[PDB]
């Protein structure tokens, strides 16, 4: 599961 990095 990847964390948010926009």
């Amino acid at each position, epitope marked *: *599961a*990847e*964390f*948010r*990095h*926009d």
Partner: antibody
Amino acid sequence: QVTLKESGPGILKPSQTLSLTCSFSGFSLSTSGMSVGWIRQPSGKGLEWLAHIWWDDDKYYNPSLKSRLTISKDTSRNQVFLKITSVDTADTATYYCARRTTTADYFAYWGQGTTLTVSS
Amino acid sequence: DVLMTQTPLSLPVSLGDQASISCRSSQSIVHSNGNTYLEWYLQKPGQSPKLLIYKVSNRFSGVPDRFSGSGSGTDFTLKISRVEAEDLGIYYCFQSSHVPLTFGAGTKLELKG
């Protein structure tokens, strides 16, 4: 100026519910790219990330606390909340809230922390 | 979960010397967007942790240039040159690529006697 200020009940008995508040200023959770997370530290021990909330309501949780955690926000009041149900001694810790943004993607700002003792 | 293993956990140094801290992730922390989200924090006694380095090698503004991050793959290093007393405390690496976000156990920079 950007500031974060944690508050909590100070002491709880095992089985009670912990309700933490992170009151912030200097930014708004209505602002695109904004987020706040909670991190705790048992004394003399290391840091553990707990939960995270984004300006658009996306929430992330650490599976290590199972269904015990709930994060929420009131952008109107500049507050982020963390609820932890069924506390036990292992929840004794200092709790920090900290900010990250999409354009400054790192925990540059932390609160001073709120300390919790769980004991019977 | 990604395990972050730091070495050593206790690091004695003479003032003015260089300290080197190792941090290894148990699996890749290269995000799908191509960046490696490895951060270093310093916690001084009685204080909240403070940011030093982000994305492996980028110094946060206001951080002295004596702090420098480097690495490749899953092996990371924080270098502290010309150590000053104010640098003493606990250093943590941290990956934010994957959920749950995870810290290393912390390395205490201490004095030689």
